[PDB]
Amino acid sequence: AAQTNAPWGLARISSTSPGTSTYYYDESAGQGSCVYVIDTGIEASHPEFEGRAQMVKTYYYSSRDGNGHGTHCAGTVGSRTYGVAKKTQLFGVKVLDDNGSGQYSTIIAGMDFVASDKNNRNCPKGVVASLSLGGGYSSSVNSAAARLQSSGVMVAVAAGNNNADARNYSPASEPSVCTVGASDRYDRRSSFSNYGSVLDIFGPGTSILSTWIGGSTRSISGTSMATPHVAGLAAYLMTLGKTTAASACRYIADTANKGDLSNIPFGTVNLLAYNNYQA
């Protein structure tokens, strides 16, 4: 299939080269997979989700996304116009409040919840969790992400937007999950993006157009915008039987666009998420 005039990040993950505007993807589109968006929530009402989004757990007074971040990243995973995996099921898990922050314990609790909740959903193609969040290093945050990954969920987490090594950040520093850095539309590492050997892959993360609360759209930047590209792509490739949750991060690294990014510090992978789609 082809999305013309697609957002640049979508086009980027279906293309070996920057600058294109068409998103080429297999028609299956992540159908049969599920992606938990662990964030500020999702405005499941947004038309772009076509009913495929739903709130499954909040840790605050409302399940409402009063911030926008979570709806934005759900959209990059699987909105019709802004999504990587346009037929995937989205489950919102609101661990961040409407100000965009959340205690470590609440984030740990939300990952434990996904590990269990998936067992009472229908995701025949497998389960992905997109974690567009992160704070300072925390071994218990890290081990929550690892348990989530161990439980059979492909976990993708943001490297963090500190322009520093991601080893000092969590869950970015957990080795078993897929830590995702950001690139911009000129195949440069995003100026804010963390880096380091714990990075596994880069996604589009600068000026990423996606759904916003109130039924709108918005373009924002961050490794938290790159994360859902890779989550969506995992959900996509899983639906295609190309890989599984345990193997998706390494599969995506193996099949990435290599060496295309500039300003990659020595000791950081130079790999860009790529769906290798051939019509």
PDB file of C-alpha atoms in Angstrom:
ATOM      1  CA  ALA A   1       0.000   0.000   0.000  1.00  0.00           C
ATOM      2  CA  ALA A   2       1.068   3.614  -0.232  1.00  0.00           C
ATOM      3  CA  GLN A   3       0.266   6.685   1.837  1.00  0.00           C
ATOM      4  CA  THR A   4       1.024   9.713  -0.268  1.00  0.00           C
ATOM      5  CA  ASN A   5       1.904  12.996   1.486  1.00  0.00           C
ATOM      6  CA  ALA A   6       2.581  10.922   4.554  1.00  0.00           C
ATOM      7  CA  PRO A   7       4.487  12.515   7.433  1.00  0.00           C
ATOM      8  CA  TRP A   8       8.226  12.492   6.827  1.00  0.00           C
ATOM      9  CA  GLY A   9       8.966   9.883   9.518  1.00  0.00           C
ATOM     10  CA  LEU A  10       6.539   7.377   8.027  1.00  0.00           C
ATOM     11  CA  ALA A  11       8.027   7.936   4.593  1.00  0.00           C
ATOM     12  CA  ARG A  12      11.476   7.651   6.148  1.00  0.00           C
ATOM     13  CA  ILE A  13      10.906   4.183   7.581  1.00  0.00           C
ATOM     14  CA  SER A  14       9.741   2.874   4.204  1.00  0.00           C
ATOM     15  CA  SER A  15      12.670   4.372   2.302  1.00  0.00           C
ATOM     16  CA  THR A  16      16.409   3.832   2.133  1.00  0.00           C
ATOM     17  CA  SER A  17      16.894   7.587   1.532  1.00  0.00           C
ATOM     18  CA  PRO A  18      15.629  10.772   3.221  1.00  0.00           C
ATOM     19  CA  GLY A  19      13.452  13.390   1.576  1.00  0.00           C
ATOM     20  CA  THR A  20      10.598  11.239   0.258  1.00  0.00           C
ATOM     21  CA  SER A  21       6.969  11.779   1.207  1.00  0.00           C
ATOM     22  CA  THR A  22       5.308   8.427   0.434  1.00  0.00           C
ATOM     23  CA  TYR A  23       4.845   5.786   3.128  1.00  0.00           C
ATOM     24  CA  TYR A  24       5.089   2.333   1.538  1.00  0.00           C
ATOM     25  CA  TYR A  25       3.801  -0.442   3.750  1.00  0.00           C
ATOM     26  CA  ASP A  26       2.207  -3.876   3.577  1.00  0.00           C
ATOM     27  CA  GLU A  27      -1.602  -3.803   3.546  1.00  0.00           C
ATOM     28  CA  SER A  28      -1.857  -5.972   6.702  1.00  0.00           C
ATOM     29  CA  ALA A  29      -0.768  -2.866   8.618  1.00  0.00           C
ATOM     30  CA  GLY A  30      -0.240  -4.402  12.049  1.00  0.00           C
ATOM     31  CA  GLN A  31      -3.688  -6.011  12.095  1.00  0.00           C
ATOM     32  CA  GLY A  32      -3.841  -8.583  14.849  1.00  0.00           C
ATOM     33  CA  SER A  33      -1.226  -6.872  16.999  1.00  0.00           C
ATOM     34  CA  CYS A  34      -1.651  -4.736  20.071  1.00  0.00           C
ATOM     35  CA  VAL A  35       0.480  -1.850  21.291  1.00  0.00           C
ATOM     36  CA  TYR A  36       0.155  -0.538  24.816  1.00  0.00           C
ATOM     37  CA  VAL A  37       0.976   3.166  24.765  1.00  0.00           C
ATOM     38  CA  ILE A  38       2.300   3.827  28.268  1.00  0.00           C
ATOM     39  CA  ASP A  39       1.997   7.588  28.532  1.00  0.00           C
ATOM     40  CA  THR A  40      -0.497  10.358  29.366  1.00  0.00           C
ATOM     41  CA  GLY A  41      -3.360   8.323  27.884  1.00  0.00           C
ATOM     42  CA  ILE A  42      -5.069   8.326  24.506  1.00  0.00           C
ATOM     43  CA  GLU A  43      -8.057  10.310  23.282  1.00  0.00           C
ATOM     44  CA  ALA A  44      -9.632   7.123  21.968  1.00  0.00           C
ATOM     45  CA  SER A  45     -12.398   9.340  20.543  1.00  0.00           C
ATOM     46  CA  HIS A  46      -9.998  10.833  17.961  1.00  0.00           C
ATOM     47  CA  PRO A  47     -11.308   9.960  14.453  1.00  0.00           C
ATOM     48  CA  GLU A  48      -7.783   9.047  13.381  1.00  0.00           C
ATOM     49  CA  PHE A  49      -7.936   5.930  15.613  1.00  0.00           C
ATOM     50  CA  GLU A  50     -11.105   4.733  13.863  1.00  0.00           C
ATOM     51  CA  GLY A  51     -12.207   3.109  17.095  1.00  0.00           C
ATOM     52  CA  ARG A  52      -8.995   1.076  17.380  1.00  0.00           C
ATOM     53  CA  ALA A  53      -7.842   2.908  20.490  1.00  0.00           C
ATOM     54  CA  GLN A  54      -9.029   2.361  24.021  1.00  0.00           C
ATOM     55  CA  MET A  55      -8.026   3.334  27.523  1.00  0.00           C
ATOM     56  CA  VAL A  56      -7.350   0.243  29.632  1.00  0.00           C
ATOM     57  CA  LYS A  57      -5.776   1.658  32.813  1.00  0.00           C
ATOM     58  CA  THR A  58      -5.215   5.012  34.384  1.00  0.00           C
ATOM     59  CA  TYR A  59      -3.220   5.852  37.509  1.00  0.00           C
ATOM     60  CA  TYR A  60      -4.847   9.274  38.059  1.00  0.00           C
ATOM     61  CA  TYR A  61      -8.388  10.616  38.606  1.00  0.00           C
ATOM     62  CA  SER A  62      -9.225  10.447  34.874  1.00  0.00           C
ATOM     63  CA  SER A  63      -8.322   8.178  32.006  1.00  0.00           C
ATOM     64  CA  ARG A  64      -8.501  11.362  29.906  1.00  0.00           C
ATOM     65  CA  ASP A  65      -5.425  12.574  28.018  1.00  0.00           C
ATOM     66  CA  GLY A  66      -5.297  16.149  29.321  1.00  0.00           C
ATOM     67  CA  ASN A  67      -1.792  16.604  27.945  1.00  0.00           C
ATOM     68  CA  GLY A  68      -1.530  15.435  24.322  1.00  0.00           C
ATOM     69  CA  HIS A  69       1.710  13.453  24.500  1.00  0.00           C
ATOM     70  CA  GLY A  70       0.022  10.070  24.796  1.00  0.00           C
ATOM     71  CA  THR A  71      -2.472  10.730  22.019  1.00  0.00           C
ATOM     72  CA  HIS A  72       0.398  11.923  19.824  1.00  0.00           C
ATOM     73  CA  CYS A  73       2.439   8.736  20.315  1.00  0.00           C
ATOM     74  CA  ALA A  74      -0.584   6.430  19.965  1.00  0.00           C
ATOM     75  CA  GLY A  75      -1.146   8.240  16.686  1.00  0.00           C
ATOM     76  CA  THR A  76       2.380   7.565  15.493  1.00  0.00           C
ATOM     77  CA  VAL A  77       1.961   3.889  16.345  1.00  0.00           C
ATOM     78  CA  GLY A  78      -1.352   3.411  14.651  1.00  0.00           C
ATOM     79  CA  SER A  79      -3.534   6.350  13.607  1.00  0.00           C
ATOM     80  CA  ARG A  80      -4.783   6.031  10.051  1.00  0.00           C
ATOM     81  CA  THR A  81      -2.937   9.082   8.796  1.00  0.00           C
ATOM     82  CA  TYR A  82       0.043   9.351  11.157  1.00  0.00           C
ATOM     83  CA  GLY A  83       0.512   5.730  12.176  1.00  0.00           C
ATOM     84  CA  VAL A  84       3.105   3.156  11.322  1.00  0.00           C
ATOM     85  CA  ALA A  85       0.772   0.195  11.932  1.00  0.00           C
ATOM     86  CA  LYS A  86      -2.559   1.602  10.747  1.00  0.00           C
ATOM     87  CA  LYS A  87      -4.608  -1.459  11.667  1.00  0.00           C
ATOM     88  CA  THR A  88      -3.083  -2.217  15.072  1.00  0.00           C
ATOM     89  CA  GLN A  89      -5.065  -2.188  18.357  1.00  0.00           C
ATOM     90  CA  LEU A  90      -4.006   0.598  20.749  1.00  0.00           C
ATOM     91  CA  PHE A  91      -4.339   0.279  24.527  1.00  0.00           C
ATOM     92  CA  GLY A  92      -3.731   3.401  26.569  1.00  0.00           C
ATOM     93  CA  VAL A  93      -2.073   3.084  29.964  1.00  0.00           C
ATOM     94  CA  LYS A  94      -1.997   6.458  31.688  1.00  0.00           C
ATOM     95  CA  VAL A  95       1.073   6.471  33.913  1.00  0.00           C
ATOM     96  CA  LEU A  96       1.884  10.165  33.381  1.00  0.00           C
ATOM     97  CA  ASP A  97      -0.381  12.904  34.654  1.00  0.00           C
ATOM     98  CA  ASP A  98      -1.684  15.704  32.462  1.00  0.00           C
ATOM     99  CA  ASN A  99       1.551  17.617  33.165  1.00  0.00           C
ATOM    100  CA  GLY A 100       3.556  14.827  31.551  1.00  0.00           C
ATOM    101  CA  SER A 101       5.232  13.479  34.648  1.00  0.00           C
ATOM    102  CA  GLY A 102       4.808  10.380  36.759  1.00  0.00           C
ATOM    103  CA  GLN A 103       6.405   8.821  39.814  1.00  0.00           C
ATOM    104  CA  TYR A 104       8.698   5.849  39.187  1.00  0.00           C
ATOM    105  CA  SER A 105       6.434   3.548  41.186  1.00  0.00           C
ATOM    106  CA  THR A 106       3.475   4.474  38.995  1.00  0.00           C
ATOM    107  CA  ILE A 107       5.476   3.758  35.833  1.00  0.00           C
ATOM    108  CA  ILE A 108       6.627   0.426  37.268  1.00  0.00           C
ATOM    109  CA  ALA A 109       3.068  -0.401  38.227  1.00  0.00           C
ATOM    110  CA  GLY A 110       1.902   0.409  34.676  1.00  0.00           C
ATOM    111  CA  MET A 111       4.416  -1.960  33.096  1.00  0.00           C
ATOM    112  CA  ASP A 112       3.465  -4.720  35.550  1.00  0.00           C
ATOM    113  CA  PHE A 113      -0.147  -4.065  34.519  1.00  0.00           C
ATOM    114  CA  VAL A 114       0.578  -4.497  30.800  1.00  0.00           C
ATOM    115  CA  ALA A 115       2.466  -7.753  31.488  1.00  0.00           C
ATOM    116  CA  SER A 116      -0.727  -9.143  33.063  1.00  0.00           C
ATOM    117  CA  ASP A 117      -3.436  -7.325  31.077  1.00  0.00           C
ATOM    118  CA  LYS A 118      -2.198  -8.632  27.735  1.00  0.00           C
ATOM    119  CA  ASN A 119      -3.211 -12.103  28.867  1.00  0.00           C
ATOM    120  CA  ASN A 120      -6.872 -11.087  28.635  1.00  0.00           C
ATOM    121  CA  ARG A 121      -6.695  -9.413  25.194  1.00  0.00           C
ATOM    122  CA  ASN A 122      -6.841 -10.874  21.703  1.00  0.00           C
ATOM    123  CA  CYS A 123      -3.473 -10.102  20.068  1.00  0.00           C
ATOM    124  CA  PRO A 124      -2.799 -13.170  17.930  1.00  0.00           C
ATOM    125  CA  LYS A 125       0.155 -11.444  16.254  1.00  0.00           C
ATOM    126  CA  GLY A 126       1.775 -10.337  19.517  1.00  0.00           C
ATOM    127  CA  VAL A 127       2.061  -7.436  21.881  1.00  0.00           C
ATOM    128  CA  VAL A 128       4.171  -4.285  21.771  1.00  0.00           C
ATOM    129  CA  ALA A 129       4.613  -1.635  24.427  1.00  0.00           C
ATOM    130  CA  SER A 130       5.688   1.853  23.464  1.00  0.00           C
ATOM    131  CA  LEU A 131       7.145   3.741  26.401  1.00  0.00           C
ATOM    132  CA  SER A 132       7.567   7.422  25.491  1.00  0.00           C
ATOM    133  CA  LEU A 133       8.913   8.500  28.881  1.00  0.00           C
ATOM    134  CA  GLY A 134      11.936   8.229  31.091  1.00  0.00           C
ATOM    135  CA  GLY A 135      13.831   9.816  33.916  1.00  0.00           C
ATOM    136  CA  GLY A 136      17.077   9.289  35.737  1.00  0.00           C
ATOM    137  CA  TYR A 137      18.696   5.924  36.090  1.00  0.00           C
ATOM    138  CA  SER A 138      16.634   3.558  38.209  1.00  0.00           C
ATOM    139  CA  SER A 139      17.327  -0.110  38.543  1.00  0.00           C
ATOM    140  CA  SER A 140      13.742  -0.819  39.520  1.00  0.00           C
ATOM    141  CA  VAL A 141      12.392   1.079  36.532  1.00  0.00           C
ATOM    142  CA  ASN A 142      14.860  -0.878  34.409  1.00  0.00           C
ATOM    143  CA  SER A 143      13.828  -4.231  35.836  1.00  0.00           C
ATOM    144  CA  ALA A 144      10.148  -3.409  35.311  1.00  0.00           C
ATOM    145  CA  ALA A 145      10.842  -2.857  31.625  1.00  0.00           C
ATOM    146  CA  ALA A 146      12.834  -6.100  31.596  1.00  0.00           C
ATOM    147  CA  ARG A 147       9.959  -8.015  33.210  1.00  0.00           C
ATOM    148  CA  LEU A 148       7.580  -6.549  30.661  1.00  0.00           C
ATOM    149  CA  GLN A 149       9.907  -7.674  27.869  1.00  0.00           C
ATOM    150  CA  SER A 150      10.437 -11.082  29.517  1.00  0.00           C
ATOM    151  CA  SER A 151       6.674 -11.530  29.810  1.00  0.00           C
ATOM    152  CA  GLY A 152       6.509 -11.587  25.990  1.00  0.00           C
ATOM    153  CA  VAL A 153       5.915  -7.917  25.119  1.00  0.00           C
ATOM    154  CA  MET A 154       8.176  -6.181  22.622  1.00  0.00           C
ATOM    155  CA  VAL A 155       9.186  -3.142  24.714  1.00  0.00           C
ATOM    156  CA  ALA A 156      10.372   0.047  23.020  1.00  0.00           C
ATOM    157  CA  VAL A 157      11.536   2.938  25.224  1.00  0.00           C
ATOM    158  CA  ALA A 158      12.863   6.418  24.423  1.00  0.00           C
ATOM    159  CA  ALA A 159      16.612   7.006  24.773  1.00  0.00           C
ATOM    160  CA  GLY A 160      15.768  10.307  26.439  1.00  0.00           C
ATOM    161  CA  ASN A 161      16.159  13.868  25.224  1.00  0.00           C
ATOM    162  CA  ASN A 162      19.274  14.939  27.104  1.00  0.00           C
ATOM    163  CA  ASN A 163      21.937  14.837  24.354  1.00  0.00           C
ATOM    164  CA  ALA A 164      23.875  12.637  26.744  1.00  0.00           C
ATOM    165  CA  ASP A 165      24.680   8.974  27.010  1.00  0.00           C
ATOM    166  CA  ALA A 166      21.441   7.063  27.634  1.00  0.00           C
ATOM    167  CA  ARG A 167      23.150   4.794  30.203  1.00  0.00           C
ATOM    168  CA  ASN A 168      22.217   7.343  32.879  1.00  0.00           C
ATOM    169  CA  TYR A 169      18.479   7.115  32.149  1.00  0.00           C
ATOM    170  CA  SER A 170      15.691   4.646  32.711  1.00  0.00           C
ATOM    171  CA  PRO A 171      14.180   2.691  31.195  1.00  0.00           C
ATOM    172  CA  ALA A 172      16.495   3.799  28.408  1.00  0.00           C
ATOM    173  CA  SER A 173      19.392   1.989  30.044  1.00  0.00           C
ATOM    174  CA  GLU A 174      17.717  -1.465  30.439  1.00  0.00           C
ATOM    175  CA  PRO A 175      19.608  -3.730  28.024  1.00  0.00           C
ATOM    176  CA  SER A 176      16.844  -6.177  27.213  1.00  0.00           C
ATOM    177  CA  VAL A 177      14.365  -3.609  25.796  1.00  0.00           C
ATOM    178  CA  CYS A 178      14.645  -1.643  22.521  1.00  0.00           C
ATOM    179  CA  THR A 179      16.087   1.769  23.342  1.00  0.00           C
ATOM    180  CA  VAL A 180      15.294   4.212  20.515  1.00  0.00           C
ATOM    181  CA  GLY A 181      17.083   7.438  19.643  1.00  0.00           C
ATOM    182  CA  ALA A 182      15.751  10.210  17.443  1.00  0.00           C
ATOM    183  CA  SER A 183      16.824  11.341  13.968  1.00  0.00           C
ATOM    184  CA  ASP A 184      15.635  14.360  11.998  1.00  0.00           C
ATOM    185  CA  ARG A 185      14.375  14.560   8.453  1.00  0.00           C
ATOM    186  CA  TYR A 186      17.913  15.095   7.084  1.00  0.00           C
ATOM    187  CA  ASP A 187      19.207  11.824   8.591  1.00  0.00           C
ATOM    188  CA  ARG A 188      20.998  13.657  11.378  1.00  0.00           C
ATOM    189  CA  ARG A 189      20.779  12.498  14.969  1.00  0.00           C
ATOM    190  CA  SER A 190      18.231  14.821  16.575  1.00  0.00           C
ATOM    191  CA  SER A 191      20.060  17.520  18.505  1.00  0.00           C
ATOM    192  CA  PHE A 192      18.432  16.429  21.790  1.00  0.00           C
ATOM    193  CA  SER A 193      18.721  12.706  21.304  1.00  0.00           C
ATOM    194  CA  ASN A 194      20.581  10.589  23.793  1.00  0.00           C
ATOM    195  CA  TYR A 195      23.098   8.117  22.409  1.00  0.00           C
ATOM    196  CA  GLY A 196      25.407   5.406  23.685  1.00  0.00           C
ATOM    197  CA  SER A 197      25.889   1.707  23.353  1.00  0.00           C
ATOM    198  CA  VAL A 198      22.589   1.019  25.015  1.00  0.00           C
ATOM    199  CA  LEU A 199      20.822   2.514  21.988  1.00  0.00           C
ATOM    200  CA  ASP A 200      19.471  -0.147  19.681  1.00  0.00           C
ATOM    201  CA  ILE A 201      17.930   1.866  16.865  1.00  0.00           C
ATOM    202  CA  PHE A 202      17.024   5.384  15.701  1.00  0.00           C
ATOM    203  CA  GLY A 203      13.568   6.480  14.718  1.00  0.00           C
ATOM    204  CA  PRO A 204      12.150   9.695  13.251  1.00  0.00           C
ATOM    205  CA  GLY A 205      11.811  11.944  16.222  1.00  0.00           C
ATOM    206  CA  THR A 206      12.177  15.569  15.088  1.00  0.00           C
ATOM    207  CA  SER A 207       9.020  17.502  14.084  1.00  0.00           C
ATOM    208  CA  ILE A 208       6.771  14.446  14.087  1.00  0.00           C
ATOM    209  CA  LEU A 209       3.219  15.176  12.956  1.00  0.00           C
ATOM    210  CA  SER A 210       0.605  13.128  14.767  1.00  0.00           C
ATOM    211  CA  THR A 211      -2.774  13.182  16.481  1.00  0.00           C
ATOM    212  CA  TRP A 212      -3.326  15.563  19.340  1.00  0.00           C
ATOM    213  CA  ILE A 213      -6.000  15.943  21.940  1.00  0.00           C
ATOM    214  CA  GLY A 214      -9.220  17.699  21.005  1.00  0.00           C
ATOM    215  CA  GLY A 215      -9.328  15.904  17.717  1.00  0.00           C
ATOM    216  CA  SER A 216      -6.444  17.953  16.354  1.00  0.00           C
ATOM    217  CA  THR A 217      -2.924  17.286  15.116  1.00  0.00           C
ATOM    218  CA  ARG A 218       0.399  18.619  16.194  1.00  0.00           C
ATOM    219  CA  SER A 219       4.044  18.278  15.260  1.00  0.00           C
ATOM    220  CA  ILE A 220       6.461  17.853  18.171  1.00  0.00           C
ATOM    221  CA  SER A 221       9.971  16.432  18.616  1.00  0.00           C
ATOM    222  CA  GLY A 222      11.701  13.977  20.940  1.00  0.00           C
ATOM    223  CA  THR A 223      12.952  10.472  21.366  1.00  0.00           C
ATOM    224  CA  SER A 224       9.466   9.903  22.763  1.00  0.00           C
ATOM    225  CA  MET A 225       8.270  10.576  19.179  1.00  0.00           C
ATOM    226  CA  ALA A 226      10.793   8.127  17.751  1.00  0.00           C
ATOM    227  CA  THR A 227       9.831   5.359  20.161  1.00  0.00           C
ATOM    228  CA  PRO A 228       6.300   4.891  18.727  1.00  0.00           C
ATOM    229  CA  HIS A 229       7.716   4.667  15.184  1.00  0.00           C
ATOM    230  CA  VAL A 230       9.671   1.579  16.265  1.00  0.00           C
ATOM    231  CA  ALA A 231       6.796   0.229  18.387  1.00  0.00           C
ATOM    232  CA  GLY A 232       4.497   0.576  15.385  1.00  0.00           C
ATOM    233  CA  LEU A 233       7.116  -1.016  13.175  1.00  0.00           C
ATOM    234  CA  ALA A 234       7.500  -3.930  15.578  1.00  0.00           C
ATOM    235  CA  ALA A 235       3.707  -4.315  15.531  1.00  0.00           C
ATOM    236  CA  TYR A 236       3.822  -4.209  11.754  1.00  0.00           C
ATOM    237  CA  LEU A 237       6.606  -6.770  11.343  1.00  0.00           C
ATOM    238  CA  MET A 238       5.064  -9.001  13.997  1.00  0.00           C
ATOM    239  CA  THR A 239       1.758  -9.061  12.100  1.00  0.00           C
ATOM    240  CA  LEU A 240       3.798 -10.031   9.041  1.00  0.00           C
ATOM    241  CA  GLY A 241       5.242 -13.023  10.841  1.00  0.00           C
ATOM    242  CA  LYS A 242       8.705 -11.602  10.235  1.00  0.00           C
ATOM    243  CA  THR A 243       9.724 -11.623  13.912  1.00  0.00           C
ATOM    244  CA  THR A 244       8.385 -12.010  17.435  1.00  0.00           C
ATOM    245  CA  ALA A 245       8.350  -9.903  20.559  1.00  0.00           C
ATOM    246  CA  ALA A 246      11.579 -11.358  21.920  1.00  0.00           C
ATOM    247  CA  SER A 247      13.382 -10.931  18.605  1.00  0.00           C
ATOM    248  CA  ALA A 248      11.785  -7.791  17.190  1.00  0.00           C
ATOM    249  CA  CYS A 249      14.383  -5.299  18.441  1.00  0.00           C
ATOM    250  CA  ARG A 250      17.252  -7.341  17.017  1.00  0.00           C
ATOM    251  CA  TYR A 251      15.288  -8.003  13.819  1.00  0.00           C
ATOM    252  CA  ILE A 252      14.644  -4.278  13.390  1.00  0.00           C
ATOM    253  CA  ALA A 253      18.334  -3.590  14.047  1.00  0.00           C
ATOM    254  CA  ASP A 254      19.402  -6.264  11.585  1.00  0.00           C
ATOM    255  CA  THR A 255      17.159  -4.920   8.841  1.00  0.00           C
ATOM    256  CA  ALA A 256      17.725  -1.230   9.631  1.00  0.00           C
ATOM    257  CA  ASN A 257      19.217   1.374   7.310  1.00  0.00           C
ATOM    258  CA  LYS A 258      22.857   1.335   8.331  1.00  0.00           C
ATOM    259  CA  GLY A 259      25.298   4.218   8.264  1.00  0.00           C
ATOM    260  CA  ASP A 260      22.759   6.790   6.979  1.00  0.00           C
ATOM    261  CA  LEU A 261      22.787   9.025  10.043  1.00  0.00           C
ATOM    262  CA  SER A 262      25.168  11.880  10.781  1.00  0.00           C
ATOM    263  CA  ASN A 263      26.382  13.087  14.168  1.00  0.00           C
ATOM    264  CA  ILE A 264      26.333   9.545  15.581  1.00  0.00           C
ATOM    265  CA  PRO A 265      28.993   9.402  18.348  1.00  0.00           C
ATOM    266  CA  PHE A 266      31.473   6.558  18.118  1.00  0.00           C
ATOM    267  CA  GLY A 267      30.126   3.638  20.127  1.00  0.00           C
ATOM    268  CA  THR A 268      26.487   4.275  19.131  1.00  0.00           C
ATOM    269  CA  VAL A 269      24.721   2.220  16.506  1.00  0.00           C
ATOM    270  CA  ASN A 270      24.168   4.024  13.230  1.00  0.00           C
ATOM    271  CA  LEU A 271      20.911   2.240  12.342  1.00  0.00           C
ATOM    272  CA  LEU A 272      17.590   3.754  11.211  1.00  0.00           C
ATOM    273  CA  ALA A 273      14.264   1.916  11.490  1.00  0.00           C
ATOM    274  CA  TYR A 274      13.264   0.537   8.104  1.00  0.00           C
ATOM    275  CA  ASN A 275      10.420  -1.723   7.086  1.00  0.00           C
ATOM    276  CA  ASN A 276      12.236  -3.066   3.989  1.00  0.00           C
ATOM    277  CA  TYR A 277       8.890  -3.112   2.209  1.00  0.00           C
ATOM    278  CA  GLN A 278       8.930  -4.195  -1.451  1.00  0.00           C
ATOM    279  CA  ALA A 279       5.734  -3.776  -3.474  1.00  0.00           C
TER     280      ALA A 279
END
